Amino acid sequence: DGYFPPGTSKHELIARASSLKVSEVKAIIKKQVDEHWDVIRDVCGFKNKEVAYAFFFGMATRESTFRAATETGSGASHAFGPLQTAETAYANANPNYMPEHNVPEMHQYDFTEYNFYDVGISVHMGIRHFLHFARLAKEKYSGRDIARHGLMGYNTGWIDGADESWIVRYADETAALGAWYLRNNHMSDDEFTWDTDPRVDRSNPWEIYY
Ligand SMILES: OC[C@H]1O[C@@H](O[C@H]2[C@H](O)[C@@H](O)[C@H](O[C@H]3[C@H](O)[C@@H](O)[C@H](O)O[C@@H]3CO)O[C@@H]2CO)[C@H](O)[C@@H](O)[C@@H]1O
Ligand SMILES: OC[C@H]1O[C@@H](O[C@H]2[C@H](O)[C@@H](O)[C@H](O[C@H]3[C@H](O)[C@@H](O)[C@H](O)O[C@@H]3CO)O[C@@H]2CO)[C@H](O)[C@@H](O)[C@@H]1O
Ligand code: NI
């Protein structure tokens, strides 16, 4: 899963992530989706691998505008990478973090400088962390609501309870942003869209995925 050489310093992991091309970040994402397709499909029910790639590109867009060195938050919300993978994804990160032992299909990397700041491990962990919440959402939700509430869980820690302004501004936005890539032939190039871009079709933003 690791992208850069093990032993690479924190400073260089960050600088080498800020200089990754959009196309290279897409390629990292697709390789994790390819590696973990079966658990992604079992949890989320996505139609196919292409639409699952697009969903994750939606996430990278909403979370980092595809800037792989983006770093935000503090403690449990402290996040890095294209998908803004929070510390709570990682094993042994802090004892006050709620456990994520419900994705046995994907290795839970320990919290270490390399595993947090390496773009490859960050992306793998972001997908595992999202499937931790999406599998919780599956207990009560079906269809597009597994991913919509999965996202609420990814961003907030809770699948339920957010204000409905945010399920639209954050989870529906993610679905609409990912579909732009699929509809406009941006699945492998350096082109990206962004939160609120008025070009993006926000109508029925989940239907493409199922
Ligand atoms: O709160 C959800 C996630 O937000 C991430 O920040 C994103 C902003 O929410 C989003 O508004 C901003 O979109 C900008 C874009 O960055 C800029 O290039 C474009 O010109 O304008 C857009 C609209 O203002 O994108 C950022 C991500 O780059 C946080 O990074 C993430 O931690 C948080 O979970
Ligand atoms: O009361 C239950 C336990 O809560 C623990 O805090 C959690 C917060 O309630 C939850 O909001 C936060 O969620 C993170 C999320 O994991 C992350 O992906 C996202 O980027 O940021 C969210 C926060 O904005 O997770 C924390 C930790 O699991 C308390 O630490 C714990 O004592 C308490 O029993
Ligand atoms: Ni992986």
Domains with residue ranges and CATH for the chain:
1-210 (1.10.530.60)
Task: Show the tokens assigned to 92.
Answer: 């042994």
- Alpha carbons 151 and 180: distance in angstroms, whole number: 18
User: Helix 144-156 to helix 37-44 angle, to the nearest 10 degrees?
Assistant: 110
Instruction: Specify whether the CB–CB gap between 71 and 14 falls below 8 A.
Output: yes
**Sign of the Cα pseudo-torsion (204, 62, 48, 40, in order):** negative
Are the C-beta atoms of residues 91 and 111 closer than 8 Å to each other? yes
For ligand 2, atom 6, the nearest C-alpha belongs to 97
Whether 162 lines ligand 1, by a CB cut-off of 6 Å, is no
Cα–Cα distance for residue pair 55/184, rounded to 1 Å = 14
Resolution (A): 1.4
Q: Is the CB of residue 167 less than 8 Å from the CB of residue 150? A: no
**50 CA to centre of ligand 2 in angstroms:** 32
Pocket flag, ligand 1, residue 85 (CB < 6 Å): no
Instruction: Report CA(32)–ligand 3 centroid distance (Å).
Output: 5
Residue with tokens 């079709």: 201
- Where are the alpha helices (H) located in the chain, listed in sequence order? 10-18, 22-35, 37-44, 49-64, 113-117, 119-138, 144-156, 164-166, 173-183
Å from CA of 113 to ligand 2 middle? 21
Experimental method of this PDB entry? X-ray
Helix axes 173-183 and 49-64, enclosed angle (nearest 10): 120
Pairing verdict, β 71-72 and 85-86: unpaired
63 lines ligand 1 (CB under 6 A): yes
